[PDB]
């Protein structure tokens, strides 16, 4: 039928912060993954539960496309079972994830000479996120045994920080755009097929 709007996800001018990650639902469409690999600006293109070279053979009930910016050296946290402040406090995949993780260096768009101000990550949380949970709160975080009463001060931390990407950062610190495609299989007819 008609073709899945991957362009709107991958070529969006602006991306979300990882703590406030974006989700777009993809349904009732043909998903030609040749587009994606053919546009070889990708430095991460990996899948779980499916083979990356065989995507064009497959059908799913729904596909979800989550997207955000992190540092290059945090892309490794975007995977089932990983630990670290990104996997635990910002964006968590389930252990049984079926889908693909794609990432590419976005230094030319997302870094700014004054320091990018909008890309944030959560660095403190009372407990880990559940898979696909999204937390946008900005409550002062009680790191000690003294209650904070909503006021920032010693051991009473603001819970987000900015990456501050600048064009001159080394490559592990440069911004990467990330798209996580979830391949959902429910007891239902399948609405996202490739050119099998």
């Amino acid at each position, epitope marked *: 039928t008609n073709l899945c709007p991957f362009g709107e996800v991958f070529n969006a001018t602006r991306f979300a912060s990882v703590y406030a990650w974006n989700r777009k639902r993809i349904s009732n469409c043909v998903a030609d993954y040749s587009v994606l690999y053919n546009s070889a600006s990708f430095s991460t293109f990996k899948c779980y539960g499916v083979s990356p070279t065989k995507l064009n053979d497959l059908c799913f009930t729904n596909v979800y496309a989550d997207s955000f910016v992190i540092r290059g050296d945090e892309v490794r946290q975007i995977a089932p079972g990983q630990t670290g402040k990104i996997a635990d406090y910002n964006y968590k995949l389930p252990d049984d994830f079926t889908g693909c993780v794609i990432a590419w260096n976005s230094n030319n768009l997302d870094s700014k000479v*004054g*320091g990018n101000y909008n890309y944030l990550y959560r660095l403190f949380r009372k407990s880990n996120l559940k898979p696909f949970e999204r937390d946008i709160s900005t409550e002062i975080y009680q790191a000690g045994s003294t209650p904070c009463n909503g*006021v920032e*001060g*010693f051991n009473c*931390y603001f819970p*987000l920080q900015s990456y501050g990407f600048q064009p001159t950062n080394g490559v592990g610190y440069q911004p990467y755009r990330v798209v996580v495609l979830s391949f959902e299989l429910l007891h239902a007819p399948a609405t996202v097929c490739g050119p099998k």
Partner: nanobody
Amino acid sequence: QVQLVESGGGLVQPGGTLRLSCAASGFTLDYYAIGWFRQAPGKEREGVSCISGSGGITNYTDSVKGRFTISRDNAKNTVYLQMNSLKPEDTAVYYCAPVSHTVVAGCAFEAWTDFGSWGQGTQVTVSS
């Protein structure tokens, strides 16, 4: 005694340059937004420049925008204030103190309401 000991400073002519720094004593800096403040002769301490915990966001008052650059090195627990194109009106004692983040992880100029541990500060004099 939690404190941020200021260093650097001194006497320069108009158009001169200074770099102040302030090092955390009794705590570590990493998660805290820090401001630089200055107390000109007979005046209140005014915020001049602030930087968020990560270093990613900075803010400057009008009279120093374009001339001062704040930065930090969390591994050394130090914050810096590079001051260029100095003017007589920049003459003041300069101090560091923790400030609050804004809810978008930026920084505001006011020291924590609690905070009483100003240092000695460091003297800056700009004169002909």
